[PDB]
């Protein structure tokens, strides 16, 4: 997302001629779905004429990068009290990155999912209180929006949780 | 704007002792000590996508100054944060990946096909002074 | 393969069907990138 944002804001155009990987699929459909990207096609001249290389570019001076991150603190407490808090009373960064990813993964395909329904799908891992903690943090980071009647719905740029890999 | 933030929206006040602070930064530090939870690491990295946490404010000051120094692009002077920020932005100038077009900084008409050929216009209608840095910078 | 092409060659191919989109692109864009 950062590479694409910098290129498009710089007035560059991205050219696709082969299948983007499963990860580049998320970030491309997200930008396309937001109406921020214009698309044009490089024509040709067999089956291949129906699948020409595609060009993508930013529509205008409009911004693609989201606003700077605020200090949304991880929910913590007495030692061992949460799956992500160890015996020295410290955040297990691995487990926190895993549980936040897991909860967003189930809320993506189920727009509107309620806390009760969500606990049923995660019962072998998290208690209801632990999901109330994860959902509150994700709302504060704007990854989720509350639907009416207390449901959760994934916002644009939802994959932008943490830097890694 | 100042009246609202100084007479109604009391955002600079402590939620507990009801002192107040001249910037949100010092209010954050105050809450992290004088009203702190039982947590071992009261300080957490304030930046984009960084998940690390610290025992003493000096270690956080060190971590921000080490891993999130605010830089300016060597070529275009636009600001960025940390080593990843610079390395991500350096792609934009890269002539190997970004097979960019070639134009004069002033003359509207130009339409070159190679980098060496573009230097002919800057070498004749201009000179080696006031050529743009991205064209000049053979830095790799 | 368009991977080998120049910026002028790519805009020329677009102009073969419609010069309006090609002229608009040349007047606005700074450069292509392969999605790699
Ligand atoms: Zn206080
Ligand atoms: Zn950090
Ligand atoms: Zn630059
Ligand atoms: Zn000129």
Curated annotation (Swiss-Prot), chain A:
It is found in: Nucleus; Mitochondrion. Transmembrane segments: none annotated. TFIIIC mediates tRNA and 5S RNA gene activation by binding to intragenic promoter elements. Upstream of the transcription start site, TFIIIC assembles the initiation complex TFIIIB-TFIIIC-tDNA, which is sufficient for RNA polymerase III recruitment and function. Part of the tauB domain of TFIIIC that binds boxB DNA promoter sites of tRNA and similar genes. TFC3 is essential for cell viability. Cooperates with TFC6 in DNA binding. Present with 125 molecules/cell in log phase SD medium. Component of the TFIIIC complex composed of TFC1, TFC3, TFC4, TFC6, TFC7 and TFC8. The subunits are organized in two globular domains, tauA and tauB, connected by a proteolysis-sensitive and flexible linker. Interacts with TFC1, TFC4 and TFC6. This is Transcription factor tau 138 kDa subunit. It comes from Saccharomyces cerevisiae (strain ATCC 204508 / S288c) (Baker's yeast). The lineage of its organism: Eukaryota, Fungi, Dikarya, Ascomycota, Saccharomycotina. The gene is TFC3. The chain holds residues 983 to 1160 of 1160 of the full protein.
Swiss-Prot record, chain B:
Its main location: nucleus. GO terms for cellular component: nucleoplasm; nucleus. GO terms for biological process: 5S class rRNA transcription by RNA polymerase III; regulation of DNA-templated transcription. Disulfide bonds: none annotated. It is found in: Nucleus. A zinc finger (C2H2-type) spans 12-35, 43-68, 71-93, 102-126. One of its GO terms (molecular function) is RNA binding. It comes from the Eukaryota. Keywords: DNA-binding, Metal-binding, Nucleus, Repeat, RNA-binding, Transcription, Transcription regulation, Zinc, Zinc-finger. Present with 1380 molecules/cell in log phase SD medium. Interacts with the internal control region (ICR) of approximately 50 bases within the 5S RNA genes, is required for correct transcription of these genes by RNA polymerase III. Also binds the transcribed 5S RNA's. This is Transcription factor IIIA. It comes from Saccharomyces cerevisiae (strain ATCC 204508 / S288c). The gene is PZF1.
Curated annotation (Swiss-Prot), chain C:
It is found in: Nucleus. The modification Phosphoserine is found at residue 6. Component of the TFIIIC complex composed of TFC1, TFC3, TFC4, TFC6, TFC7 and TFC8. The subunits are organized in two globular domains, tauA and tauB, connected by a proteolysis-sensitive and flexible linker. Interacts with TFC3, TFC4 and TFC6. Belongs to the TFIIIC subunit 5 family. TFIIIC mediates tRNA and 5S RNA gene activation by binding to intragenic promoter elements. Upstream of the transcription start site, TFIIIC assembles the initiation complex TFIIIB-TFIIIC-tDNA, which is sufficient for RNA polymerase III recruitment and function. Part of the tauA domain of TFIIIC that binds boxA DNA promoter sites of tRNA and similar genes. Participates in the interconnection of tauA with tauB via its contacts with TFC3 and TFC6. Serves as a scaffold critical for tauA-DNA spatial configuration and tauB-DNA stability. Present with 15800 molecules/cell in log phase SD medium. This is Transcription factor tau 95 kDa subunit. It comes from Saccharomyces cerevisiae (strain ATCC 204508 / S288c) (Baker's yeast). The chain holds residues 612 to 647 of 649 of the full protein.
